[PDB]
Amino acid sequence: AFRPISVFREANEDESGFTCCAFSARERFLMLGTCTGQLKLYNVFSGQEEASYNCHNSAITHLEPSRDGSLLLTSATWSQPLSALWGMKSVFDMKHSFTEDHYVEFSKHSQDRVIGTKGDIAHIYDIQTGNKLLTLFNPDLANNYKRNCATFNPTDDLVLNDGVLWDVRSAQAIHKFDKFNMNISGVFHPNGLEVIINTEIWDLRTFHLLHTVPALDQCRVVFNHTGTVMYGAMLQARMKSPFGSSFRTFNATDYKPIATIDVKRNIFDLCTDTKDCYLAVIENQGSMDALNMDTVCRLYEVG
Numbered sequence: 001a002f003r004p005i006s007v008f009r010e011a012n013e014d015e016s017g018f019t020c021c022a023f024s025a026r027e028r029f030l031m032l033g034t035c036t037g038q039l040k041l042y043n044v045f046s047g048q049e050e051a052s053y054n055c056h057n058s059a060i061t062h063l064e065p066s067r068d069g070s071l072l073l074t075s076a077t078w079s080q081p082l083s084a085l086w087g088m089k090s091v092f093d094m095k096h097s098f099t100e101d102h103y104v105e106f107s108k109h110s111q112d113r114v115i116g117t118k119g120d121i122a123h124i125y126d127i128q129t130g131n132k133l134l135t136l137f138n139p140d141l142a143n144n145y146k147r148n149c150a151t152f153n154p155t156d157d158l159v160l161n162d163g164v165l166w167d168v169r170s171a172q173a174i175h176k177f178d179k180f181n182m183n184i185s186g187v188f189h190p191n192g193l194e195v196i197i198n199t200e201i202w203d204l205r206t207f208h209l210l211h212t213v214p215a216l217d218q219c220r221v222v223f224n225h226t227g228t229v230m231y232g233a234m235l236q237a238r239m240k241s242p243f244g245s246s247f248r249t250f251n252a253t254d255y256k257p258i259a260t261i262d263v264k265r266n267i268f269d270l271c272t273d274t275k276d277c278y279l280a281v282i283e284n285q286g287s288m289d290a291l292n293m294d295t296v297c298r299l300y301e302v303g
């Protein structure tokens, strides 16, 4: 049972503009991006704003803090640069930018690289220099997914871009996964053994199709930190809500559905705390069908 614990909004704004979230390295504090390009730090229990920083001149779509608390990735809608890396030690400052990448992620084991996505193209950057180390795109193997998002595997040896598996060291495509949908390009399971591409679950070693999970169709997915639960929310077909009003949970060990939660409001983002005690969900109290952006963050205790 996802038990509500707290609710809060962007303080003292006529219309609340939270768009995305991630827990900080400090217990009790959530980082939220906003539709005017700010980063906010909030106490999730009191609902009070602690700090605000200026990141972009357009809506933040997504953000990701490094596990060590030293760095932050942000992505925006229209800005130049589209994505950026921020230092959060001593002073909040821009370390590097990624001008044309509309989505960025850290590498997973050692967080020394950033992978950015531009359409069906992946770009790998060094955190220290900001230099682009690699561009990954093979015209012969492209799936041309419409909502592609390039990603590292748990040990940072492989990248999945546009449904193509790349060996990062050789910068060579080693396998193209067959196309079953127009949009979703896929993620690695944290177990290191499986690739989840829309409804298809592939074995990474043999490239065999292991399972079909129809309820994952058109979903973005995130796992809890401990890798026991997978959350999926279906994309929707100024910033409109990326998701509909529902999310689904699955057992990460066997892909069996656990719960389907309809929050009856469009969802902008979802995350868990580092101890996987809580779920924070950004939900629009209004609707952009009426051009009303007025989001809240809802905090739930996971059952």
Ligand SMILES: Cn1cc(-c2[nH]cc(C(=O)N[C@@H](CC(N)=O)c3ccc(F)c(Cl)c3)c2-c2ccc(Cl)cc2F)cn1
Pocket (backbone or CB within 6 Å): 019, 020, 021, 061, 062, 063, 103, 147, 148, 149, 220, 221, 222, 231, 232, 233, 239, 240, 242, 243, 247, 248, 267, 268, 269, 270, 271
């Ligand atoms: C205007 N705009 C908003 C987005 C966006 N916002 C949140 C996104 C996003 O992907 N959020 C992740 C979690 C995370 N923070 O990584 C998520 C995963 C499972 C879910 F059930 C839910 Cl509700 C969200 C995303 C998102 C959606 C699609 C893609 Cl391909 C990439 C994204 F980052 C993107 N554009």
